[PDB]
């Protein structure tokens, strides 16, 4: 006669412990801080050339080069300063939904409905770009992929799983399980020893790369989580879901700090990103424009409204000089 | 005001853009069809006739027209999270097995899937071609097992023609977008006959799209 009431008792105990640890709120502490003035960002560059919906982008570590993936089977590498196309890579499968840039800058990665992560090498003796590796083993569509170094990569699939791969041998070094729905977003810690995954079961999880088991679980959203990002200091993270709500979670207190939502906004959220100092929170929406939130006061401070279809990807450079937004109208825009 | 090495970069970018533009118009001459079904419905039969894991792409030609078909039935995921990738397809090809009205209930699942697909906010103007397979098996089975068991509200004869018409009507009145899209029902036979049906349907779709983009419609 197996019983599951002990699980309910454990959940109740965890909830009681979280409640007993909430002596105040983040809003009550940042009440005396000076509000951020109205943020006016202007478009500097418009990167044209994609002929279909753009589904992901990633910035280079040097804050000058970026890579964009589109559904016409093209990965384009842009020099953002001069809007020059450094490379144009044709994909074997046109149904791509993610892309990544190596920290060193020698490789790029892509994946999609083919359940295969392709790693392309950019530095070759010949003048072309060749498919360095093809990692297979996922039974669902690939949602996100992030590089640890030139040899290890971490990916999440729509089969409710994440995987840490060793590129040299092409085998899954580690697997991460526990989500009851498709995993949609994945974010790496600054020190690359832990990462957060947000899935369709309205839940985020904190993993351990070296060991390989889930450490903490964060709930609170009422619908699928589509995007996730890490705070610069590595002790908090922001999530965005389909219920028109961003949320901030703190690792040490194991709770939810603040909710970024407005009554007028009823569309979902596709992208989430922070600024260099972490004071601003960018968020891309399906209402064709992006919003800037004061991460310490939950007050909207600006709107970026230069796009004509759902904003799909959003990124901020390492030095925080510019913000790049890519939408379904096949245009990437740089805002400064 | 550019340097010696800053102008060759612009030349390379212009060549890359030229190649991108050239490749863009080559992929716009191919008809893209999205193949859907309830599984074990005869999707495989349809694929075999027309030609001469993740997603499977099949290319073929029929009377100087290029067709690309994307079988996506091997994706055990949430359909809501990747259906919008197929927003610009020319047509959908929905396969249904007629001989599954007695097995287990599967017919009702097929109707539910058809209703979900046809009334999506992404397919408000994308035509659907409905294939009904296992016609001979349906004829053999119906004369031994009545259709009234599957549909308690059915009122009519047991003969094959009336039941087939009833099933076709029940599948065809499930769309609320009776204005912007058409449904081309066809009972799949053993013969190059299905390819002709698909060719006629896509020709109608192409003519309507050409009228829409030029400006008359």
């Amino acid at each position, epitope marked *: 006669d197996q019983l599951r009431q002990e699980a309910e008792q454990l959940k109740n105990q965890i909830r009681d412990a979280r409640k007993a640890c909430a002596d105040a709120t983040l809003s009550q502490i940042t009440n005396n801080i000076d509000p951020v003035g109205r943020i006016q960002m202007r478009t500097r560059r418009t990167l044209r050339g994609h002929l279909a919906k753009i589904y992901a982008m990633h910035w280079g570590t040097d804050s000058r080069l970026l890579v964009s993936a589109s559904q016409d089977g093209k990965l384009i590498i842009w020099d953002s300063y001069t809007t020059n196309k450094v490379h144009a890579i044709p994909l074997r499968s046109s149904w791509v939904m993610t892309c990544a840039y190596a920290p060193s800058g020698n490789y790029v990665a892509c994946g999609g409905l083919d359940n295969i992560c392709s790693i392309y090498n950019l530095k070759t003796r010949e003048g072309n770009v060749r498919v360095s590796r093809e990692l297979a083993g996922h039974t669902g569509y690939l949602s996100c992929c992030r590089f640890l170094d030139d040899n290890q990569i971490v990916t999440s699939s729509g089969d409710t799983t994440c995987a840490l791969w060793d590129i040299e041998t092409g085998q899954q070094t580690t697997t991460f399980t526990g989500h009851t729905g498709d995993v949609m977003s994945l974010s790496l810690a600054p020190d690359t020893r832990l990462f957060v995954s947000g899935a369709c079961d309205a839940s985020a999880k904190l993993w351990d790369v070296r060991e390989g088991m889930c450490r903490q679980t964060f709930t609170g959203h009422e619908s699928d989580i589509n995007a996730i990002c890490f705070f610069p200091n590595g002790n908090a993270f922001a999530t965005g879901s389909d219920d028109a709500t961003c949320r901030l979670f703190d690792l040490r207190a194991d709770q939810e700090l603040m909710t970024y939502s407005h009554d007028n906004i009823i569309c979902g959220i596709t992208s989430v990103s922070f600024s260099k100092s972490g004071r601003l929170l960018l968020a891309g929406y399906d209402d064709f424009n992006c919003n800037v939130w004061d991460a310490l006061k939950a007050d909207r401070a600006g709107v970026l409204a230069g796009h004509d279809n759902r904003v799909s990807c959003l990124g901020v450079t390492d030095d925080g000089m510019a913000v790049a937004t890519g939408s379904w109208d096949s245009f990437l825009k740089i805002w400064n | 005001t550019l340097s*010696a090495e800053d102008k060759a970069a612009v030349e*390379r970018s212009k060549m890359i853009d030229r190649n991108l533009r050239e490749d863009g118009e080559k992929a716009a001459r191919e008809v893209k069809l999205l193949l859907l079904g309830a599984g074990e419905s005869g999707k495989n039969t349809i694929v075999k006739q027309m030609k001469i894991t993740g997603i499977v792409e099949t290319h073929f030609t029929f009377k100087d027209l290029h067709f690309k078909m994307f079988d996506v039935g091997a994706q055990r995921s949430e359909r809501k999270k990747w259906i919008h990738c197929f927003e610009g397809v020319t047509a959908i090809i929905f396969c249904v097995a007629l001989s599954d009205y007695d097995l287990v209930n599967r017919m009702h699942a097929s109707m539910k899937l058809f209703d979900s697909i046809c009334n999506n906010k992404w397919f408000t103007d994308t035509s659907i071609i409905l294939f009904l397979n296992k016609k001979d098996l349906f004829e053999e089975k119906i004369k031994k097992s009545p259709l009234t068991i599957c549909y308690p509200e059915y009122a009519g004869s047991n003969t094959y023609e009336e039941a087939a018409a009833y099933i076709q009507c029940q599948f065809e009145d499930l769309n609320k977008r009776k204005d912007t899209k058409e449904i081309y029902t066809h009972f799949t036979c053993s013969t190059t006959k299905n390819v002709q049906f698909v060719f006629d349907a896509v020709t109608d779709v192409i003519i309507k799209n050409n009228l829409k983009d030029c400006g008359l419609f």
Partner: single-chain antibody
Amino acid sequence: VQLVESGGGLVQPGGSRKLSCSASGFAFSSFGMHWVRQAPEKGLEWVAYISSGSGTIYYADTVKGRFTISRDDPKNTLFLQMTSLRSEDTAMYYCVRSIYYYGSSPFDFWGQGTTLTVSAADIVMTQATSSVPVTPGESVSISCRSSKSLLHSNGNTYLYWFLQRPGQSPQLLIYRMSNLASGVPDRFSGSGSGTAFTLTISRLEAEDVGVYYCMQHLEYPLTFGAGTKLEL
């Protein structure tokens, strides 16, 4: 990657000669290609350049009109039709590839060369020292100077360093005065200012014997230095 060139013999003055540069081992259509000559017992100088796609063509002022360049992408061959050959065209012609994008390393690979023996506003780069007798183990610095400042508004100082081993072809060491070429040992370092340039070697082995040449790429009539021999 391999460039082999043939078609150089003995031509009477005023004749016509054709050179062929066969490429095999890389994407030939994506590479702009140069022609570089080296007169016997003298330095090497630029001759002609044709870009990828045959868009822009540049000739030296002492070669313009007499020489024409042409590439054949389908079978990866580079041509140089010379007309009205003079007695000053006796040299060894090199085939050099160069690809230009953000962060690339032009003039990376050089072919072996073809000996031709005819019978009988430019930035001047100065290498005052031509002979440096030095021993392995220590550090030797190679200096260079240019009439015009090579620093550009974009922030890149276009200066290149090449090493020509005895009985070999020039090889790239440093591009844009700071970046080290792929395959070059870390013992080589480069630095300088907008008009003064230096090349320093930390540890010197027996394979460093050769001639070191400068190179400018801010302006099209690309100019080499006089060379600085490093005897054992």
